[PDB]
């Protein structure tokens, strides 16, 4: 039984859920950011699509209740399912997080602001010009399609992480 919450209907006509099926979705006529507010708890009514969350490695968080036990019915019963709050991966679970609002456009989240990433790290942005790539990087971030991607490694808390990073060059 899967446990992923999608509540998508673009009142403003974004055409955002038209972007999950590509060969077509590549549109961003208007592209003309990272500083957020610390992660609390969202509940599936505000969510559409997966909820990616950055350890150096990207992870999707599953539906659950007020406690940790999961939901398994596609987030729909006042489903306080995403416990996105944590300190930092040396101590906590992740740095920061991104999911798509049903708005059609979404916002990010991150640890208290201020290599240097494991010190001053919140969202998927390693540096101002570089983010971490996850299967929905183009969807949540449609203005970074022209970034060049490459492989990198990073040691965090004693374990090695292998990442794919996209950058404006």
């Amino acid at each position, epitope marked *: 039984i899967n446990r992923t919450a999608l509540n998508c209907n673009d009142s403003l006509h974004t055409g955002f859920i038209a972007s999950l099926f590509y060969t077509h979705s590549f549109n961003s006529s208007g592209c003309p950011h990272y500083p957020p507010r610390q992660c609390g708890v969202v509940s599936a009514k505000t969510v559409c699509g997966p909820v990616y969350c950055f350890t150096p490695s990207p992870v999707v968080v599953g539906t659950t209740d007020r406690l940790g036990a999961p939901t398994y019915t596609w987030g729909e019963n006042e489903t306080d399912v995403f416990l996105l709050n944590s300190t930092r991966p040396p101590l906590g679970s992740w740095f920061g997080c991104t999911w798509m609002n049903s708005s059609g456009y979404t916002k990010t989240c991150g640890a208290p602001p201020c290599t240097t990433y494991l010190k001053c790290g919140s969202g998927p942005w390693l540096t101002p010009r570089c983010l971490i790539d996850y299967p929905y990087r183009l969807w949540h971030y449609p203005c970074t399609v022209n970034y060049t991607i490459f*492989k990198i490694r990073m040691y965090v808390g004693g*374990v*090695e992480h*292998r990442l*794919t990073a996209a950058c404006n060059f």
Partner: antibody, heavy 118, light 114 residues
Framework: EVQLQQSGAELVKPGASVKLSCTAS????????IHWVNQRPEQGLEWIGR????????QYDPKFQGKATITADTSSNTAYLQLSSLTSEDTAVYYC???????????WGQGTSVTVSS | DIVMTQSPSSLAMSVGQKVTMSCKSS????????????LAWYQQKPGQSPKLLVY???TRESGVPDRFIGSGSGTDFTLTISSVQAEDLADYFC?????????FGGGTKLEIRR
């Protein structure tokens, strides 16, 4: 230093073929390059090729083409090395090593020794 | 193909002393954009798989003791152990990660004098 588990010691008759395994644990293979290095009895090291498992792109040393074909399957987090038409100078140990953009082999596997004899 | 010549082929050192072995390439390994030398040093203890000591000529790999130091530029490279230990016995390989095909050195075998 991520960990990579290789297949077991293989005995191959002269002329036969053999495929070697290299399975990766603790990370997604698509964020690394997967190289294959060779070492013959009391010899140096030799780079055979590499594969980008994110797009399948493979580079090889010219001296090994036709003899070695590198493949990767992100389903099983596993890369392979297929040796075709083996001779006695193919008797060696075959390593698999990860890399980042720098192409420096930062983490290796335990190796797989191949013996080509009748 | 870039040719890597390692000297010497064999090396003996008492414990606690400093030893140096050299690596030379057939063409420059210095990047003009990067100002980085794409040379790597590997240690292969007998009956084991090679381990990454230094990459980018002088950047020591995480977890490696600080007695291993890579130095050089352009075409002349040296690996140095500040004070060799009884465990340091190995075949030390230098490799260029500059251009395809990536070529290896002959290797410098380190013995211990007791």
């Amino acid at each position: 230093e991520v960990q990579l588990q290789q297949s077991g010691a293989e005995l191959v008759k002269p002329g036969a073929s053999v495929k070697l395994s290299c399975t990766a644990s603790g990370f997604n293979i698509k964020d690394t390059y997967i190289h294959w290095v060779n070492q013959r009895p009391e010899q140096g090291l030799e780079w055979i090729g590499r594969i980008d498992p994110a797009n399948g792109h493979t580079q090889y040393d010219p001296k090994f083409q036709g003899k070695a074909t590198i493949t990767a399957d992100t389903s099983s987090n596993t890369a392979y090395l297929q040796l075709s038409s083996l001779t006695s100078e193919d008797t060696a140990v075959y390593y698999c090593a990860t890399s980042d953009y720098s192409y420096a082999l930062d983490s290796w596997g335990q190796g797989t020794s191949v013996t080509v004899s009748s | 193909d870039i040719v890597m010549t390692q000297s010497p082929s064999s090396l003996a050192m008492s414990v606690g002393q400093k030893v140096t072995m050299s690596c030379k390439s057939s063409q420059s390994l210095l990047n003009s954009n990067n100002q980085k030398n794409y040379l790597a040093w590997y240690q292969q203890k007998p009956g084991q798989s090679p381990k990454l000591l230094v990459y980018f000529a002088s950047t020591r790999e995480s977890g490696v003791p600080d007695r291993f130091i890579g130095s050089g530029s352009g075409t002349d490279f040296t690996l140095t152990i500040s004070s060799v230990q009884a465990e340091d016995l190995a075949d030390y390989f230098c490799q260029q990660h500059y251009s395809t095909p990536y070529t290896f050195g002959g290797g410098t075998k380190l013995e211990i004098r007791r």
